[PDB]
């Protein structure tokens with residue numbers, strides 16, 4: 001077989017989604033990883049509730065931003081995360097209204113990939129499934145990406161400002177990459193996804209704050 005992987009072909013990744021005017025990328029990145037482990041464990045692909053996270057992970061700041069680890073920790077000690085269906089995404093923080101009745105998954109903690117180590121991230125994506133990663137999506141070059149293996153010498157691995165999901169990795173025009181599921185609607189980039197540079201000195205800090213939930 002090939003030196004690459006794509007969990008979209010295993011039905012691990014739900015349809016692209018759109019944050020709207022809410023800094024909820026962390027929530028979508030978290031839901032993404034959770035959904036992947038859920039499919040892997042129960043064989044059912046399902047959208048988990050990003051709003052549940054936005055309104056209940058108090059260690060984060062709702063539409064102000066957050067970390068995926070805090071999100072996984074929350075799911076763990078809250079002993080559950082509601083499904084999208086049971087806790088719709090309204091794109092604006094409101095009081096926590098988590099309901100045990102709509103629980104569609106749980107977490108048993110999380111593991112973090114060694115900072116800046118793309119080989120470790122590769123192994124993780126291989127062993128586990130979709131992995132949450134943080135990146136530098138400042139550059140306008142990132143803003144209107146549409147195809148190819150994105151790479152911009154101007155990216156700053158120290159400037160992590162967006163949270164997304166790594167659902168695979170491979171090669172293209174002889175370009176090693178990471179298969180990234182963004183959350184700015186299917187309309188953005190190649191159907192919501194974007195291929196980012198791999199083994200290129202940790203371009204855009206793809207491996208500086210990666211993690212996955214245990215389930």
Ligand SMILES: *[C@]1(=O)[C]N(S(=O)(=O)C2=N[C]=[C][C]=[C]2)[C][C][C][C]1[N]C(=O)[C]([C][C]([C])[C])[N]C(=O)C1=[C]C2=C([C]=[C][C]=[C]2)O1
Nearest residue numbers: 023024025026060061065066067134137138160161162163
């Ligand atoms: C996320 O929604 C990404 N948006 S964005 O609009 O998609 C965008 N992305 C890149 C460049 C420009 C626009 C922007 C900001 C909100 C949000 N980002 C985050 O939540 C990041 C996530 C990664 C760095 C891990 N984290 C925070 O901003 C953050 C973490 C916090 C916090 C407040 C309190 C506690 C933890 O903010």
